[PDB]
Amino acid sequence: AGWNAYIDNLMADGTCQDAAIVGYKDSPSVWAAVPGKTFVNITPAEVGILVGKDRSSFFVNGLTLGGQKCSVIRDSLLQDGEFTMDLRTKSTGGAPTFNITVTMTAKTLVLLMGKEGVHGGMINKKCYEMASHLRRSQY
């Protein structure tokens, strides 16, 4: 049923613990997400920073994804062919951290967060594969 279909599809693995489809085109809005998690709370200010003008400041300060302080690792969100940006959450004292990869499409931003011990490459390929499906349906 709706965008919720793509989500269920994204978590069905047991590897991810959060997904979300967010429209960034001039009126940010989560189109569907794992409920009761973090991405569901992504705000327009936050989304306005990922799809930003400068691709440098967040390297120093960082950025939150639903109030979650994330450290950018690689940034290729605006670069053709790639379409991906990779992040690692920022815990506190032994608290475990998780990788997140947001991939842009014509209209959407596909976010994906791994569980405990899932390598970023996994989460990237996966979030990437899905973004290409929307990307081919003019989405």
């Binding site: 390297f59 120093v60 300060n61 960082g62 302080k69 450290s71 950018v72 690792i73 690689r74 940034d75 062919g81 790639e82 991906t84 990779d86 690692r88 920022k90 951290t97 011990g117 899932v118 390598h119 970023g120 490459g121 996994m122 990237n124 390929k125 990437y128």
Partner: protein, 374 residues
């Protein structure tokens, strides 16, 4: 045989380190050269192996047109960079690449196309079941049992500073400096040649180098060691040439390594080892910085100069805010750190829920590296 046996291949610009994942040392260290037979005029024949490689082509020399395939960590020629790989399996470990997964090692800032090329080759050409490309510096930090930190890699042709967050290199803050072994060798020569020690070349450049590895140390205070140098004699060391004299260096011992911290010594405008390390860190996220400053690992031959730790420990402390604990970590085995790192990485069951499988190369192609390998 009695298990999956993943392999590790740490590709140095000079020395190639092969081995089976799970070992104590590269179970094969050979030069990275490909001799391409010759003589000229165009002859009566030449014979076997249109290309000789490794330790064998090394003797050959006078008969073969010796070639260096990798420069500054970066692959220069795939034809002969393939030969070295081919050899590693079919000549060194004597394994059929077809049955062993493999970790390939790479340089910070390896161009995209090089990555893909490396991928298409391992899969289409050697038919590896699965592989994974890891940055040489990340593996070194693992070798010292860490995941977050900053590696100062100094081999022969260049130095890089790689701030790593949880096992992920942060490219935006990776810094590269054109000083490393070679430079220290050319300086020392130029500085030994002062009392007309004139080594220069007649196979005499390798003597400077052996002095460098054997007699150079690093000063905690240049000026003051300089003053005590001039006051003389428990700092003046001698060296025996092959055929001949017992030579003497003094000021020279702690002067060549000092160009690391002072590249104007080498006529070059450039920040030193210390400030470079510092610059990378500033480029990082404010929240991890304090954990980079207390995890500056050293790897590479050029880091082996005794005293480099303390001079490092002291020099960064004056550049940085007091709020953190500068703690230069410099592992005793920092020459083989990189291989040992990947040996450890390619030993874990996780390496399997981490790599590119042939199936994946068939569905996606070489571009699958920009995805999986970070």
């Amino acid at each position: 045989d009695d298990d999956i046996a993943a392999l590790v291949v740490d590709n140095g610009s000079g020395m190639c380190k092969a081995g089976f994942a799970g070992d104590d040392a590269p179970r094969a260290v050979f030069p990275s050269i490909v001799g391409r037979p010759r003589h000229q005029g165009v002859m009566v024949g030449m014979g076997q192996k249109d290309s000789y490689v490794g330790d064998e082509a090394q003797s050959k020399r006078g008969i073969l047109t010796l070639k260096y395939p990798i420069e500054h960590g970066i692959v220069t020629n795939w034809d002969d960079m393939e030969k070295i790989w081919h050899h590693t399996f079919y000549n060194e470990l004597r394994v059929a690449p077809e049955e062993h997964p493999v970790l390939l090692t790479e340089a910070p800032l390896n161009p995209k196309a090089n990555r893909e090329k490396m991928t298409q080759i391992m899969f289409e050409t050697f038919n590896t079941p699965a592989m994974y490309v890891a940055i040489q510096a990340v593996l070194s930090l693992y070798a010292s049992g860490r995941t977050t930190g900053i590696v100062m890699d100094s081999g022969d042709g260049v130095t890089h500073t790689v701030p790593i967050y949880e096992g992920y290199a942060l490219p935006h803050a990776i810094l590269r400096l054109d000083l490393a072994g070679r430079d220290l060798t050319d300086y020392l020569m130029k500085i030994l040649t002062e009392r007309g020690y004139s080594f220069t070349t007649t196979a005499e450049r390798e003597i400077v180098r052996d002095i460098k590895e054997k007699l150079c140390y690093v000063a905690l205070d240049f000026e003051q060691e300089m003053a005590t140098a001039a006051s003389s004699s428990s700092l003046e060391k001698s060296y025996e040439l092959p055929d001949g004299q017992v030579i003497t260096i003094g000021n020279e011992r702690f002067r060549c390594p000092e160009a690391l911290f002072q590249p104007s010594f080498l006529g070059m405008e450039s920040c030193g080892i210390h400030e470079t390390t510092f610059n990378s860190i500033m480029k990082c996220d404010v929240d991890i910085r304090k954990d980079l400053y207390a995890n500056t690992v050293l790897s590479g031959g050029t880091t082996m100069y005794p005293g480099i730790a303390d001079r490092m420990q002291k020099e960064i402390t004056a550049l940085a805010p007091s709020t953190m604990k500068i703690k230069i970590i410099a592992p005793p085995e920092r020459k083989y750190s990189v291989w040992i790192g990947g040996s450890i990485l390619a030993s874990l069951s996780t390496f399997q829920q981490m790599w590119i499988s042939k199936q994946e190369y068939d569905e996606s192609g070489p571009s699958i590296v920009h995805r999986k390998c970070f």
